Write a protein that binds this ligand. Sequence first.
Ligand SMILES: Cc1cc2nc3c(=O)[nH]c(=O)nc-3n(C[C@H](O)[C@H](O)[C@H](O)COP(=O)(O)O)c2cc1C
Length: 169
Amino acid sequence: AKIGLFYGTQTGVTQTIAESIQQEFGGESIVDLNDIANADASDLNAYDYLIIGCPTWGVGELQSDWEGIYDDLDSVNFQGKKVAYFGAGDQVGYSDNFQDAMGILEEKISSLGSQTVGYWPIEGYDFNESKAVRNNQFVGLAIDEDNQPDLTKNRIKTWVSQLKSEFGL
Ligand SMILES: Cc1cc2nc3c(=O)[nH]c(=O)nc-3n(C[C@H](O)[C@H](O)[C@H](O)COP(=O)(O)O)c2cc1C
């Protein structure tokens, strides 16, 4: 597929969101799903369009599989590649670290010559601080199954429509 989606998950939510995103794009012919736990950093080189999914755990920390491959990211060819991001978080229980993991990954990957695409509005959420927020907007899709599960389906629909316009679809 032209789009490679790499996700990490601890309690399965980010994987379910990833599957939904793949479905919304049109399925396997359009988006390849890859669990970062079973990947080598070089696997990301096979795609020119990437989607990076990761939930936040601990206190604003990267999900363990992403944490484990983080130091290898600088060896990947991200030069001129368009990269989108999504994450699962809990804005009520972790208002000061909402979606910090997505922010950490974008901050690292965007510093490696890539182009972040898929910015998302912060207005549909209530939180205090987030490393995923730059210039008053999220660096990618923020999903909250703990507090806003009813909004997930339409958020994904909206975001994917937005991304197609930015991914050549
Ligand atoms: C112990 C614990 C720590 C968490 N830490 C954070 C955090 O710092 N920020 C946040 O946005 N959500 C945090 N969450 C919420 C998770 O990101 C959320 O439940 C998400 O759906 C988990 O996704 P996953 O199932 O893909 O692992 C935490 C939840 C728990 C139970």
